[PDB]
Design a protein around this ligand. Sequence first.
Ligand SMILES: O=C(O)C[C@@H]1CCC[C@H]1Cc1ccc(C(=O)O)cc1
Ligand SMILES: O=C(O)C[C@@H]1CCC[C@H]1Cc1ccc(C(=O)O)cc1
Lengths: 226, 227
Amino acid sequence: GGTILVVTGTGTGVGKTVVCAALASAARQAGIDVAVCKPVQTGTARGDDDLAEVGRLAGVTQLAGLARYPQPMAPAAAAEHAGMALPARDQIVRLIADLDRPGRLTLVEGAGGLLVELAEPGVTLRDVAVDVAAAALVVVTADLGTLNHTKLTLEALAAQQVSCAGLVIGSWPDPPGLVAASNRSALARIAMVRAALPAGAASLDAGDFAAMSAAAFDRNWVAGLV
Amino acid sequence: GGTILVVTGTGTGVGKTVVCAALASAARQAGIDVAVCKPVQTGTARGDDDLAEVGRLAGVTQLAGLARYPQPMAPAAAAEHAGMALPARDQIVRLIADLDRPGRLTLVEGAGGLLVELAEPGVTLRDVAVDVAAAALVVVTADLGTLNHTKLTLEALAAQQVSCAGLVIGSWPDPPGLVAASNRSALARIAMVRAALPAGAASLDAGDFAAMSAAAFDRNWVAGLVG
Ligand SMILES: O=C(O)C[C@@H]1CCC[C@H]1Cc1ccc(C(=O)O)cc1
Ligand SMILES: O=C(O)C[C@@H]1CCC[C@H]1Cc1ccc(C(=O)O)cc1
């Protein structure tokens, strides 16, 4: 196999997808073959499609999903609303395992934070990460409260021996501000901050997004991922 | 001693203080002697004073502070900004132990969420709860994202064998939307939802607050907290 990395976050709406896209873009620009697996998508009624964001922003074509739920809710609630079960754990893990190949960086995107249910019954992205021996990249905010949520997520990773590949600040403000600047220094004291994406990066066109991504990450770190 | 409960939250601004006030009020209405302590208060330059707020709302008079910092930031950053040190672990323990008394419910209000550093080095409200054998009451929101934060918080309590006294929804919308109702149902499957404080509870006067508080908690559960 290659390198499997779950891209999780401290919560919902913290920039997981755009960080997934940004890392994919940087990796592809380093010559790395990149696949993204998002087993479960919700909020499809309003048009959510994080795989398409990755495909458009980063140029990834190996974009694997299993289930799509109309309502913009956590997978379990969206599945309950729709009256249909979430996928099975085996579906998700085998899909990722089949995507994984030598020389490839396979990013795995869940929904919401680390402990949200992704597959029936009650299996999370952390469970999946354990099953496929992935490390976890954790997308954080720079906002008030990020320190607790980041420490909570890192503890939960370590509790099941899922290695933390670093943090990415999903949206970095301009100009920072006292709290954002303080949080960035504090976050760097608990884990490597791999990048801090400029606020609004998710709306860029493909060209600007690739330039942003290459600048966002350390070249050597990206190159060493596989 | 009596019963020590730390009142924590999934994060900042989730209603910890109002919940502390609400529980204090319900317990006082049960005849339970209540003390509330706030090891670390930040935001004094903004006028933040959670003890004064619990006193105003619930009529608690036994209010013990320790460290206070001007800036409305996490304790470590507020202390750093003030050129001050955080308190030491033994100072928070002493502050709580001095309050603990048979038949008394002592509430310890944290700053931000459970894993926030309250004492150097990296000492948290969870560490303090371990030191004083306190259970933890977890204030949650009903908003999108609460489920992950609540499970993260409950796992962190269990990782150190800190009993979870239950959850309190810090603000409950009336009427609830689809997500809030789904979240409350999902929260109750995670742990006991002891109360859901009505939105705007913090704005009530002492009489309406006391009524809301007596209505918000199960009086048997409250009385059961303290022997
Ligand atoms: O991936 C995202 O964060 C954006 C999704 C868009 C639709 C709802 C988001 C999924 C989600 C929301 C709340 C919770 C919870 O833990 O309460 C778990 C997962
Ligand atoms: O008690 C509260 O939640 C209200 C305080 C008012 C001013 C800052 C709040 C404290 C705090 C903020 C962020 C974090 C973090 O983990 O980033 C930890 C603690």
